[PDB]
Structure 1
């Protein structure tokens, strides 16, 4: 259950993944249920996550309501995100619902709107990745974002409400590929202890 290089699998019912590009190091310890700890040092880009991977046949509406209850001790030293993250396919989209960050509030673009949900206010953004790594090879794809206006590191994220807001703004979504509580680091070091992470689909825990 010690993961220090790229790996995808299932641990205690959750689909976990460790992903990094070259350089630096990271360690992910897979703990009970959706929980895990992460540490990273001198990386270029690293992501640690536990959630659900899907078989690319259903819209978010067809999967049903997705909600994540979480808590994490988030200790970045530099740039990092604490978020819900995942992908759709057809179209290929990477997405983020960011509740906390390190020194830099992402994603550096002009907001397209705002959503109020889960006691917070989130700015909504759309950015572009050109010829970058993806779940479907080197690709050009949009990134969709909801970013909280102030940081928090525990609570509930009503994922499907974000998806409805994005679609209302014309941020087209494809078939679900993944939804997961994620820690991302960029050109930084840090640690995170995700001590609570429960994904419920239609009110039922994974």
Structure 2
């Protein structure tokens, strides 16, 4: 229930992962979607809990996807706190970022704004040509919604970001996974996800 090295698994209905390329990481797996983590001397690391979806379905088929979450979030350098996931056909890596450390991701310039869940989100898109992905080295898009001001608790209605992105011409494939995610880059920090209730279904 405390992880220190790369591991993926499932507990209490939530898929979890700790991953780092190097450095010190720890992750306490608490009930349900909740977890606690710390990192130092890392290059890249991530800690996440959510779901790898069991079918090959669109978000209209899966039903509502939302995270009712709360995190006591103390990054010491580069870091962000987000919902993270992928779609396939088309292949998309997506991010809904609510807070960050020293650097607000992803860089570049937004193409729109979404007013949802009491906040304003900047929308970004990238193409990454022949780069590592969940389907090997290949080309994929990245979609980002990044809050204009930091917050660390509330509801992220992922379905509404999906719908807004599609209205802005950003096609969603079948949903592969979605998880509440803490990232670190060349930094130290800690975060306690004390609440993470992931809705999957219905309207």
Same fold (TM over 0.5): yes
Partner of 1:133 in structure 2? 132
Give the Cα separation in 2 of the matches to 1:121 and 1:127. 20
Is the 2:19–2:47 contact (alpha carbons within 8 Å) kept by the matching residues of 1?
yes
Residue 121 (1) aligns with residue 120 (2) = yes
Partner of 1:5 in structure 2? 5
Aligned length: 203
CA drift at 1:19: 2.1
Partner of 1:194 in structure 2? 193
CA drift at 1:203: 5.7
CA drift at 1:71: 0.4
Q: What per-residue deviation string (whole Å, max 9, x for no partner) do you get for residues 90-115 of structure 1?
A: 12211110000001111111111010
Partner SS state of residue 61, structure 1: helix
Residue 16 (1) aligns with residue 6 (2) = no
Partner of 2:104 in structure 1? 105
CA drift at 1:56: 4.9
Q: What per-residue deviation string (whole Å, max 9, x for no partner) do you get for residues 128-168 of structure 1?
A: 33444322223332211000010000001111000011111
Q: What per-residue deviation string (whole Å, max 9, x for no partner) do you get for residues 13-37 of structure 1?
A: 10111222x2212111110110001
**Cα distance, 1:189–1:131 mapped onto 2, change above 3 Å:** farther
* Further displaced range: 119-128 or 48-57: 48-57
Question: 1:61-80 alignment to 2 at 5 Å?
Answer: 61-80=60-79
Residue 58 (1) aligns with residue 57 (2) = yes
Unaligned runs of 5+ in 2: none
Is the 2:63–2:202 contact (alpha carbons within 8 Å) kept by the matching residues of 1?
no
Partner of 1:87 in structure 2? 86
**Cα distance, 1:94–1:51 mapped onto 2, change above 3 Å:** same
Is the 1:55–1:176 contact (alpha carbons within 8 Å) kept by the matching residues of 2?
no
Q: With the length of structure 1 as denominator, give the TM-score of the two structures.
A: 0.93
Give the Cα separation in 2 of the matches to 1:5 and 1:132. 24
Q: With the length of structure 2 as denominator, give the TM-score of the two structures.
A: 0.94
Is the 1:109–1:127 contact (alpha carbons within 8 Å) kept by the matching residues of 2?
no
CA drift at 1:47: 1.3
Name the Cα RMSD after superposition. 1.5
**Cα distance, 1:3–1:131 mapped onto 2, change above 3 Å:** farther
Is the 2:8–2:15 contact (alpha carbons within 8 Å) kept by the matching residues of 1?
yes
Unaligned runs of 5+ in 1: none
**Cα distance, 1:173–1:155 mapped onto 2, change above 3 Å:** same
